[PDB]
Amino acid sequence: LVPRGSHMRILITGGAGCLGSNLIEHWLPQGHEILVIDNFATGKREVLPPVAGLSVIEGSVTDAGLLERAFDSFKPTHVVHSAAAYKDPDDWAEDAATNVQGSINVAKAASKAGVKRLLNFQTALCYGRPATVPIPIDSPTAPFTSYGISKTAGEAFLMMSDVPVVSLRLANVTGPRLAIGPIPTFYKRLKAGQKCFCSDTVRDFLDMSDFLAIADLSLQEGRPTGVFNVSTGEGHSIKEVFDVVLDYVGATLAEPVPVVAPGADDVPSVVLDPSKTETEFGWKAKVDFKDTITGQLAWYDKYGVTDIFSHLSAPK
Amino acid sequence: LVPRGSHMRILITGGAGCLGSNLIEHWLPQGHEILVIDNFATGKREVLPPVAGLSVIEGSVTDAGLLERAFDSFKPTHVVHSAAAYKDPDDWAEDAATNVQGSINVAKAASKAGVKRLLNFQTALCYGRPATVPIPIDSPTAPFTSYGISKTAGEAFLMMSDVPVVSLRLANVTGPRLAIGPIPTFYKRLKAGQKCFCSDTVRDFLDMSDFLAIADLSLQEGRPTGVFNVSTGEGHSIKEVFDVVLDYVGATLAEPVPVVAPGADDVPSVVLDPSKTETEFGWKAKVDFKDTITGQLAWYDKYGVTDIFSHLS
Numbered sequence A: 001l002v003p004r005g006s007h008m009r010i011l012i013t014g015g016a017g018c019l020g021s022n023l024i025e026h027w028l029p030q031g032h033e034i035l036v037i038d039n040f041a042t043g044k045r046e047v048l049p050p051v052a053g054l055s056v057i058e059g060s061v062t063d064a065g066l067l068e069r070a071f072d073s074f075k076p077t078h079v080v081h082s083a084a085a086y087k088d089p090d091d092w093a094e095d096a097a098t099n100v101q102g103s104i105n106v107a108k109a110a111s112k113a114g115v116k117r118l119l120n121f122q123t124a125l126c127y128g129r130p131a132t133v134p135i136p137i138d139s140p141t142a143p144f145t146s147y148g149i150s151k152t153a154g155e156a157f158l159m160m161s162d163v164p165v166v167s168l169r170l171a172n173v174t175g176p177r178l179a180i181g182p183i184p185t186f187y188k189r190l191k192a193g194q195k196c197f198c199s200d201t202v203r204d205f206l207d208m209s210d211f212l213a214i215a216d217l218s219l220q221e222g223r224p225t226g227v228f229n230v231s232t233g234e235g236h237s238i239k240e241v242f243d244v245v246l247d248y249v250g251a252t253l254a255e256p257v258p259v260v261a262p263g264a265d266d267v268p269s270v271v272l273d274p275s276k277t278e279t280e281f282g283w284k285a286k287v288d289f290k291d292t293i294t295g296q297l298a299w300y301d302k303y304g305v306t307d308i309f310s311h312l313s314a315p316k
Numbered sequence B: 001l002v003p004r005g006s007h008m009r010i011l012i013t014g015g016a017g018c019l020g021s022n023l024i025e026h027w028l029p030q031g032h033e034i035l036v037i038d039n040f041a042t043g044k045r046e047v048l049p050p051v052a053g054l055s056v057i058e059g060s061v062t063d064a065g066l067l068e069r070a071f072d073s074f075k076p077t078h079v080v081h082s083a084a085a086y087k088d089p090d091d092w093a094e095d096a097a098t099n100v101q102g103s104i105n106v107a108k109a110a111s112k113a114g115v116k117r118l119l120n121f122q123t124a125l126c127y128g129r130p131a132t133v134p135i136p137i138d139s140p141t142a143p144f145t146s147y148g149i150s151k152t153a154g155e156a157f158l159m160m161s162d163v164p165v166v167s168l169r170l171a172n173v174t175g176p177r178l179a180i181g182p183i184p185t186f187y188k189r190l191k192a193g194q195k196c197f198c199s200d201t202v203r204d205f206l207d208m209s210d211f212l213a214i215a216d217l218s219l220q221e222g223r224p225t226g227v228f229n230v231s232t233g234e235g236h237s238i239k240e241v242f243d244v245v246l247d248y249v250g251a252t253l254a255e256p257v258p259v260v261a262p263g264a265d266d267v268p269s270v271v272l273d274p275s276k277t278e279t280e281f282g283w284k285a286k287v288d289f290k291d292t293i294t295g296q297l298a299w300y301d302k303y304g305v306t307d308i309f310s311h312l313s
């Protein structure tokens, strides 16, 4: 079993999604054994080819018996909890079941199984309308949407675990198979010459490579535990994203792009302060904004705007 | 249809509990119709006698089918959501099912049924360890126990409802059938000549009469909605509570009462600032600390330390 002396058996809930599939493509070539649990609510079957070292259970983190059996059999050394429901903002029941009860079941199962470390991903919706930007890690949680409320409580339950837990509050991560948001929107619209708009909002953006680096650190024995902000700590407007994409695809506009006031629930600025993560993990994001966006675009050049292109080579 | 029409059809989840039963004893003599839904996890079957105007469904807020059936037939005008799980701090799944999923199910059912107003009760555990005490209503929520975390999310879901919602963050309410906590413990043990202890913590206490007053205003058409602290705004140590019980019962101690450090998960001081509640509702608590404690003891004097004595005939 390899990496010699550092071989992991990783159980990844939500492993068929964006971050989950990128983590598999990162870890599987290293010889780690991976078990995915996913219900394919938003994740895709085609990112999980029948390949060596990779096992898949189709099912839900809401199903505590299923998890018990999975943990019982697979005996994971490490857990990455990447499953989340969000696609229907009115389906509060689903959000609470997946994000709260799913987090509880994973924490309970991981404790019984003697998991070494659990890694959870948290949305910046946990902060609600922030008192200040960039957002300090000691900011209160103050969510006001179903996705935010349920994810805040799931994280909070995971923090009560006797399992060492790292919960990463994430900037917007970019990389293979990201097929939603302003980046692919501006890409498909500008190339097609369709009409675009930008919310007058500010966000942070993180290259996949820097995400993989902190994920790696979070799973190492005796590293820090708790909640951490993962970002460059720099905010850029949606308009700035747009200007990068427009220059990249080499289009000229007929009229100025509208930059419009955000809707009532669209938080104007959400940028995370990473300083404590830099202090405690020794980690710093290496990829600037322009390289992050253009890196996303270069992937699109190569594969299309698709969440189903796998970098793994079947059959086994 | 009395009182005339401010007659309410009130669906009260958790109706067999301390607050729910006191609310029933307060509203039923006025002529309101009440439906209770309770699974009896902590509430008692004995406090809901088969009396005109009161009906009971044994079930869970976690059962959406049951709730849809209850809402469809009873057709309530008002909901009081008083169901909560907490008795096992390690049963995170149950606190989440009852306090989060139960709150969602009740909101969704109340919206579908076009309920006029919904009242929710919130634990001060929602504030976790506060930066300022007394605790302002705009203080963040920062729970770190199962009960606090699940109750914080349940409340935040209810606030997303299109039904007008009032969620009251409460002081420690005293009154009929409160059979837990420092007050009955000191009462029983001091009378038995048994040794006690006080935790070195500060808390606020609210007489049932004041709780009843704000519950009334919360249900009135056109009144404020949102979250509100319900308290006198004054804090008192558990030792002060002790001294009140010791004086009341007439006992004399053989040793001074040991005062013990707060447990790891106990917040040293939890006292709520009700100013905004005063401003928006025109409500102020009337019964002071000593009268609040002594009125609880006078109840035990009459009925014993019991959660089953009903004032309904």
Ligand SMILES: NC(=O)c1ccc[n+]([C@@H]2O[C@H](COP(=O)([O-])OP(=O)(O)OC[C@H]3O[C@@H](n4cnc5c(N)ncnc54)[C@H](O)[C@@H]3O)[C@@H](O)[C@H]2O)c1
Residues within 6 Å of the ligand: A013, A014, A015, A016, A017, A018, A019, A020, A037, A038, A039, A040, A041, A042, A043, A044, A059, A060, A061, A062, A081, A082, A083, A084, A085, A098, A102, A121, A122, A123, A124, A151, A169, A170, A171, A172, A173, A174
């Ligand atoms: N991508 C980001 O920049 C970002 C930012 C902040 C937080 N996060 C968090 O990271 C995690 C992954 O995000 P993503 O971008 O990969 O989203 P995603 O939708 O691609 O991945 C979520 C995965 O969870 C699965 N899932 C949903 N409900 C489930 C359930 N009941 N049981 C098992 N699986 C279930 C989905 O099918 C999907 O495969 C989520 O927890 C999310 O909240 C992501």
Ligand SMILES: NC(=O)c1ccc[n+]([C@@H]2O[C@H](COP(=O)([O-])OP(=O)(O)OC[C@H]3O[C@@H](n4cnc5c(N)ncnc54)[C@H](O)[C@@H]3O)[C@@H](O)[C@H]2O)c1
Residues within 6 Å of the ligand: B013, B014, B015, B016, B017, B018, B019, B020, B037, B038, B039, B040, B041, B042, B043, B044, B059, B060, B061, B062, B081, B082, B083, B084, B085, B098, B102, B121, B122, B123, B124, B151, B169, B170, B171, B172, B173, B174
């Ligand atoms: N009494 C107080 O001083 C105090 C203080 C702060 C907040 N609160 C809140 O007020 C409400 C009532 O508190 P209480 O002191 O009456 O507690 P209680 O335990 O006496 O009443 C709660 C009732 O809910 C019932 N219940 C539990 N799970 C249920 C479920 N799944 N479905 C239906 N019923 C269920 C219990 O059986 C009980 O009768 C709770 O929401 C509590 O968090 C009370």
Ligand SMILES: O=c1ccn([C@@H]2O[C@H](COP(=O)(O)OP(=O)(O)O)[C@@H](O)[C@H]2O)c(=O)[nH]1
Residues within 6 Å of the ligand: A181, A182, A185, A197, A198, A199, A200, A201, A203, A238, A262, A266, A267
């Ligand atoms: O065509 C688009 C699509 C997205 N956005 C904006 O881009 C930001 C980030 O996108 P996302 O969909 O992730 O929404 P968020 O959860 O950050 O509010 C939001 O403020 C959106 O309003 C935009 O301006 N134009």
